[PDB]
Symmetry: D2
Subunit: 498 residues, 4 copies
Amino acid sequence: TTPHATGSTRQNGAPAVSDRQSLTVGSEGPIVLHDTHLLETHQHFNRMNIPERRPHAKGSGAFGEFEVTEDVSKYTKALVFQPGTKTETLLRFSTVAGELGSPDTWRDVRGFALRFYTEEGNYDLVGNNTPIFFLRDPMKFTHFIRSQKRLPDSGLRDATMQWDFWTNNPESAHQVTYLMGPRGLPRTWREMNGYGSHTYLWVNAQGEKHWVKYHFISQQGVHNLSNDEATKIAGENADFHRQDLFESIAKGDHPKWDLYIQAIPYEEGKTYRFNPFDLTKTISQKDYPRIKVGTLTLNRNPENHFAQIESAAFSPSNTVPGIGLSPDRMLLGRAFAYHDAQLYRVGAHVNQLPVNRPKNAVHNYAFEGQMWYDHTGDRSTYVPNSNGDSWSDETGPVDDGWEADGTLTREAQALRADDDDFGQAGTLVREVFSDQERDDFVETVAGALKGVRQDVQARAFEYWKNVDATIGQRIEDEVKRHEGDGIPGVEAGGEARI
Amino acid sequence: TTPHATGSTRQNGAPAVSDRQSLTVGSEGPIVLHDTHLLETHQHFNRMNIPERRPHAKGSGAFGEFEVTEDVSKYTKALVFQPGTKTETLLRFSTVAGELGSPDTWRDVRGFALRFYTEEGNYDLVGNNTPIFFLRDPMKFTHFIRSQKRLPDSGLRDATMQWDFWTNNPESAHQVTYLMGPRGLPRTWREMNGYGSHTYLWVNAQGEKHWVKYHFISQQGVHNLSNDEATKIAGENADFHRQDLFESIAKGDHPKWDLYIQAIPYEEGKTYRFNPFDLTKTISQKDYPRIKVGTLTLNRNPENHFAQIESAAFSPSNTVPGIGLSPDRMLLGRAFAYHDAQLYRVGAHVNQLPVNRPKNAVHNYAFEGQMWYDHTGDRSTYVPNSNGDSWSDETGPVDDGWEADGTLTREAQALRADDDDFGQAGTLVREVFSDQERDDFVETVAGALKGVRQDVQARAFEYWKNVDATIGQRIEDEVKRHEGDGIPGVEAGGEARI
Amino acid sequence: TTPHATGSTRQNGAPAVSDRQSLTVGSEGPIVLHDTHLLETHQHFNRMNIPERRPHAKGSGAFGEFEVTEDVSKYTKALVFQPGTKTETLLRFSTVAGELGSPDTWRDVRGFALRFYTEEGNYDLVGNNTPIFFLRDPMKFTHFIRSQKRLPDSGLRDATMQWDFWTNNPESAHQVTYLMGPRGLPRTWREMNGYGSHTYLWVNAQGEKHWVKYHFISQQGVHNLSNDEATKIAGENADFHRQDLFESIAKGDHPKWDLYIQAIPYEEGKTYRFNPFDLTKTISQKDYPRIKVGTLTLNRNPENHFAQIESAAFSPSNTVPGIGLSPDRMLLGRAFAYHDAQLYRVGAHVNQLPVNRPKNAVHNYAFEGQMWYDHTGDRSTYVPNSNGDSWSDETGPVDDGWEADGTLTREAQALRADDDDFGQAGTLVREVFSDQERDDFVETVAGALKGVRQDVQARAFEYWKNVDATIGQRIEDEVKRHEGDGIPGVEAGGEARI
Amino acid sequence: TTPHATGSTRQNGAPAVSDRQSLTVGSEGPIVLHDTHLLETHQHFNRMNIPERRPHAKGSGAFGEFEVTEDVSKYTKALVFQPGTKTETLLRFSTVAGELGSPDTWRDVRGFALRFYTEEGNYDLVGNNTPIFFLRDPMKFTHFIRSQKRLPDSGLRDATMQWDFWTNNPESAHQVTYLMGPRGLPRTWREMNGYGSHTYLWVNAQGEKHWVKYHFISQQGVHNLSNDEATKIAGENADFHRQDLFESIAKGDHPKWDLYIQAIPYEEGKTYRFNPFDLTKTISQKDYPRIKVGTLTLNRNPENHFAQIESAAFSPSNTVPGIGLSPDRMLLGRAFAYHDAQLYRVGAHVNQLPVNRPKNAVHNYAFEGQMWYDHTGDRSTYVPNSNGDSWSDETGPVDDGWEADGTLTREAQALRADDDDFGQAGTLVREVFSDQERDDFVETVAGALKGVRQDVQARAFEYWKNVDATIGQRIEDEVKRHEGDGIPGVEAGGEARI
Ligand code: HEM
Ligand SMILES: [O]
Ligand SMILES: [O]
Ligand SMILES: [O]
Ligand SMILES: [O]
């Protein structure tokens, strides 16, 4: 390269001389303080780690493309979803509870975080492999996630703490049922479905509004593992899912999902018999059928896992024109929480990293800070200005809002006609599951209750009978026999647990 | 508590009102920006994680006591090792390569980081479950650890990268042999030995010097698992070792280790036939026998894992009077590197956290910074001063140094009479291992080479024949038969690996 | 101290040996990497600085006591304001625009940040030396502060940018008038008044509500400097105010302020002819007279400026029972913004530093993070729990809220009968100022406009005529004569400005 | 721009809608939590500040070009200094003690930090406007800088602390003399000289070594201000120097400096009668005359002060082939300290910001970390490797080293024949200063001693008599008369100082 090159450089671009021996006073002497190559390489190594995501620490992903193949222009003006549009994507899959090195095949919810690099900005649909969640208000979220993680003294996960939380927060029943059924253990990420979970607002060119749910249906089908199979794989290959996805794309096999929405007319959101703003509820497909939008294909692996996946920063706040949030309190908390976490996790200029930059021109009133890579030159730092540096100043009602009225309060959402904590769970167990799925469910739930502190077990029996009397008695019988599956990722009991 | 109490507070000590519902405009309305309890709890949750240790992310520990029961005052003036002395301790055990959530029973070196809370400061003996290491100069360390972690694109561990490094750095043979033998898989932390590895300097009251090795011999014996057993446990219980230690102490069973040293007279350090400043070498016990010092007992579990173990910050630089470092280049790099990592990992006042504070009075010229909990009031910020605020000013040769002479260089340490890369490895395989250990070793090493890229396998066969011709041919035969154990924690081959 | 002591320690508590010479290979040789005392002291020094506050970087303060001497129990249940109560306080004074080293006597608003260490938590009244502000919605705040700071290319403050902002945001007129009058330059912090500015909610024991303004009237009177005097002092003594306060307390001279409130009945807040939720408005004392509460006395200097003042973290969100926020949008933004800034500026455990800790027992659902000094042991990390670890769960309307109704919008607050941008400014200039104050005001404002870009000057003449036709013509005449005072802290014109 | 554009974007590139009003529930209602544009802009604003440099917080600079016009190839192989070479530069000027907002015209040393963007990396000559410094060992540096900053309780600078340090560290006399003479107050940065201060190693193509000093002589001459003039300007224009430089370049007036070196033959470094490795010493130009190299011209202002100047990160460790460090202990400490400070101040990827990137290809073994903008793709993370990813492995003595021999010690450098603390100071006062400069010096030093605590004043009189008996008696006489200049930036005495 240069006349004095040595095969590598220091950080300033000068030849490094050696990547293999330190600078010493003679062969036998001490290292000197001015071994700058030693200092720079150690100091960098010491700063390679960044805080893991909380939650969803363990994951990986791939790039691809979304292709619109239907006409949903009547429901939305969003450029990404206009007829024929092809958009570059990035999808990160994850578990929830486990940390950075934790086995992929623990029983858990999976994340399904999808970015669309649109002509009007980055559009993030940060979903999960379930249409619902455990909770309906974000004040409970911190407590739920901590219940799912480790005991403060011993540092062990503990099914007693999990069940103490779940039983004391019966809104959790719908999603815990789903978690304990077949789908708590996907065989691969390619073989699970993806959902937005929340209701979102779609707005058309004329300003008319619909409430929407998103459903990504795998073209590879839904395939799951048993508890015993997942536990075996956890030991043999802690990165089974990560490996599977990367190898599949490497071999040219491009996993696909079809996107469908449900669309509720604006005024019907207030009157529907289940609350669409309640994240523990599904919306009947009889009442609001799925409408096809198009197809997602993953076709390109990362070249750098840390820069393109670990550093990726997805947010529900990354909406685009034609798509808004909704009165779902959980979604409203998420609009604050992700960007906040990322400022700490990654840094103040997280959105200037390549994977997080939009394709379109950014013109944003934010300046300075640590690691300001793409500065604004002499552009105006204030508005209005007499300098030819533009700004935004639309007044009046926004196109992606709604109405509200009341006193400031902290209380449960009002029940719709058919809202409760246990009904939809009960449908799932009685009507959706097969006989064999029911059998397996009883083995799972009894297994998850083994060794749990008796007072909490008794509350869990009442909880499962409220879902369904027959399943609940079956679970209780099996737990009183000291039977049931080992659950990958967690256990109860013993002198280091509750 | 207070007249207006509600059961919990915000950060300012005021009643929090609700830990369970957010502040909304009516039951059905949006959350308001001024839900300060929601913001404070989310913002804290978002900042709970700190970067994991690199390396040694996965670990746990316990408090105890060291009791001196012999007289080694002739070799050292250190208060902690004077006859009869009892000192409070903290011991953190760990693996090396795996991240925060990784299974405890992966094949790996274990850490054995021991702090003594002495009357003359915190004395840290930051050791491992092996007397040696893979390398003899710290410029190689960053490269070794990265070889032990994940592929940059796919994020998978890869035995090809591990073996490419090891074969290209034959100084690694002694420790890789130890790693691939019985002791790469302890059954429990209670059932492994601990070692300082490095030579350290001991200095007596009269100033006379000895070079010392530390050996902690478990009173519970050395007990190991097979590859197959460890892989099974990795799936069933990723925190097997953590759990075992906590439960054992909880039950009143106090694990013990006896400390012995070897003591080389100062002048003999320069002449000994193996280089004691070379971390890939053991010192013959025939030449320098073990001398008993005393007994370590662990007897108290943490009450808070994160504050007392995760935040603990051990450093080889934490010497005390009577104990010094040595010309071992690896130890000299460690004296810089740990404190540096901790400033980033934990913060600038890491040593003001309770677990890291000394028992004795600190009088240190450092001030301000983020999170300055224990400030110095109006004390002098400079020296000398006319203010009655003391400082240190000893001139001349230090009591814990040595001599050096030469030109500034980057080169291998000079060989002693019997120094090489393969000899001591060869002794271990031929003379220390039993027949059955040899058999198992061949299954381990062949297993670890399965699927490794052929060019690297061929180099590995030469490497193992250099250790011992018979073991090397046995390994090569078994690898060419496509046989050998699955190794917990790693594999090779396939479209997502080298 | 210890047998081997040397006069100071390293961070681990061991003797440091020397604070005055580095560890070298002979007298003439290089410093060795393992000079750990050198590394620790440099690495700490390198991390002493933390980001300065934005805004209000330049300031200082003192501790004292608040004594209630009247009965305002009818308006509030807050313990701190109940008859007879004596409460420890801390008060930090500041400028706004200038950075850490900037002269105290620049023309500017002053901060008046008062903490009360109450029995029901820390109560922060974070005010200023003015009853109003420049703006009525916090989206404008970032832009205003940047207009008040430096040009992006040259790094100079610039009166053109200041006036471009002010003229394009005519809501600023009331406060700019106050800024350009006598009170923009206090002689000392002891000789200025303090105000809450915002309307706050007070709530009595029976739940009845009043809207309140706070007024701290100096017992030392209101004394100001001329522009020329302040500029002279800026050169001679950049820390004039800091010095004055510390010396005055050191000499035993305890500066005092009397607290008065105005109290508007709840329902009258909606109907009053000026909007009390509009921070650019004062409330007539004829309509709502001042009601005495008690007396503030400062009587104790800090022993450590950095730990007790620089690290202090005040927030309007630090309310206590009996005191709430209000529909003032500016206050509502501040409830989020201060705690957020402090997490970055100081750290995640900012509220565990001594100066920021409450006197009463904290029971808060937040755990872990960097620098966790006061950990929660084995306490429950979730709610509800079966572990005896309490939490809060009040449901329904809060005691310190109010009502709202409408669609989501971005628009100006609705005008009350007498709301406008220029009226109250006009009263101040015409009716409150003396003849001599008017004269000085014209010299100040003309001075501040000297060298400002002509197009912006013309807008400023219209702006000042809208305040008052006579003052505006006088200013314009003087600016067209190229006359007026030099303003401490800023200028316009030239090749490095707009 | 886009169909739905509004004049600005959020961080994701989507239209922001309004930079001027917040999202509220009706005109009169509260702001909602999901005003993401409000949150993003406030959260960014709150993170714009980064820690100021310690020391040298206050400064500015400009870009330019260096042109070699002589032949010094016989002394160095460095590409930047080969005949005819033209190289892009960046120069930052600064004071030392004052913080970010402090007046430019305080009495102080000035920094002269020059980067050359060479074909073999960034070459940083981080100098000052003086050929010497206050100290000769870096363990004293932290203490000196803190002595120059603020009292721990009151936060005031204090000449008593300054003089207590200086008198107790008489090595300081040479540089304090220079500081208190004419050159402590440059009129402009354009009108001062620049120096490397330290001895550096130059190495030619054949490996032959010389010790070198760098001297940048202003073509605008050396022009200074009186104390009274500088104090006046401090009040009137705190950014006088910053403004001057920017306006001068804006007007097309390109300030220039001629570079000269002194060159000492390698073996003569050990024998010279003054120690060239002692930073408190100058080298006689009679013994080693100046040799011209070329000319520095500044010709381009920054477009963004924060990105190009505030974030610039200069280090003496940024040497290039042909230029090395030296046995000067102060320089050896600086090789560690700057890069360390920058990791905290700016971040782990400070050297990836544009202003800090080299022009040539970087091939450096460092990966991951926060804000990794320019990732290494799938390149090898270790060495040696079988992957075609190069590394460095030169063995033996380095081309830019030297010899050493001795025991590890902490002691003063050995004196050369003519080394002492006061001699060179004495020459400066007696022989270099004019009569009128001597007069002014007496007024400066007496002024700086006014109000200083008597015990420290008495030590200062002995100190100045040791420099020169006549100057010392003159200073003492004037101080006992209570006379002398006000010093811009500092004073003594009173109840808030020592
Ligand atoms: C929406 C408008 C405002 C916002 C977003 C805002 C934001 C901030 C921020 C972020 C800080 C730095 C906090 C820290 O780092 O500790 C601060 C400081 C300060 N603010 Fe504001 N501010 C606003 C308006 C005001 C008003 C109207 C007042 C007076 C009523 C005020 C008084 C102060 C004071 C006195 C400080 C210094 C606190 C101290 O001494 O530590 N601010 N502000
Ligand atoms: O999540
Ligand atoms: O390590
Ligand atoms: O502020
Ligand atoms: O410096």
